[PDB]
């Protein structure tokens, strides 16, 4: 995996790896968070805080010592840091060795929440996905299906119950677009869309609570670039089977 999920902890030799295999970010047993190139050359570090330490992804990436104090932080410069951002923000380590923290607000959803859902897990449907009748996703006790008949439906599985549906009868594809919109088409006729065309690539979140949301990447900070006041345009990255977050790549500068 090249990424860290909200609230994930790494410690005692656990690491992530860039998609090309060249860069490794490892939270060592001696308490140093170190970025390696080619498995042999350290190119950046926190410097060690000793045994018993860990790194956690919690809006910021924070290194904790054994006493439970924060000893190093990304220190993302932010107007507001609410507690639920800690449940949303994720990190990517990309192919030039930079690593970046994203925190993305729901642009559209199948339901309007009265408060954040605690401990929810999202199955990510990435940019460029083209759903075709017969496509399905399973997260927990819920199933997202783009059906033979063109309907996009969320079912509770056991027992089987319709939770939400588009009623896009006849449709033949549903496309998570580069422009930020999610659109259900018969041929090239648009039958339904999320109204989220902004020019920033879309992805969807399908939850293990039977909900679907669309979000767009919002890069706030990188190790090499610092804090960014406006989010640059990124492009979909190469995910592998252990990645559970969106994966992106970003250019070296403007
Ligand atoms: Cl360094
Ligand atoms: Cl996860």
Numbering used by the authors: 2 to 255
Q: What do the authors say?
A:
In an attempt to determine the location of the pyocin L1 d-rhamnose binding site(s) and the structural basis of the d-rhamnose specificity of pyocin L1 we determined the X-ray structures of pyocin L1 with bound d-mannose, d-rhamnose and in the unbound form. The strands contain a tryptophan residue which forms π-stacking interactions with two other tryptophans in the β-prism to stabilise the structure. This interaction is conserved throughout MMBLs, with most members of the class utilising it to form either homo- or hetero-dimers of single MMBL subunits. Other structural elements are also common between the two bacteriocins, namely a C-terminal extension of 30 amino acids and a two-turn α-helix insertion into loop 6 of the N-terminal MMBL domain. The overall root mean square deviation (rmsd) of backbone atoms for pyocin L1 and putidacin L1 is 7.5 Å, which is relatively high due to a difference in the relative orientation of the two MMBL domains.
Here we report on the discovery of a novel member of this family, pyocin L1 from P. aeruginosa, and show that it utilises lipopolysaccharide (LPS) as a surface receptor, specifically targeting the common polysaccharide antigen (CPA) that is a conserved homopolymer of d-rhamnose. Alignment of the pyocin L1 protein sequence with other lectin-like bacteriocins, LlpA1Pf-5, LlpAPss642, putidacin L1 (LlpABW), LlpAAu1504 from Burkholderia cenocepacia and LlpAXcm761 from Xanthomonas citri pv. malvacearum shows that pyocin L1 contains tandem MMBL domains with three conserved QxDxNxVxY MMBL sugar-binding motifs. Pyocin L1, as predicted by sequence homology to MMBL proteins, consists of two tandem β-prism domains characteristic of MMBLs, connected by antiparallel strands propagating from the end of each MMBL domain and lending a strand to the reciprocal β-prism. In this work we have shown that pyocin L1 targets susceptible cells through binding to the CPA component of LPS and that primary recognition of CPA occurs through binding of d-rhamnose at the conserved QxDxNxVxY sugar binding motifs of the C-terminal lectin domain.
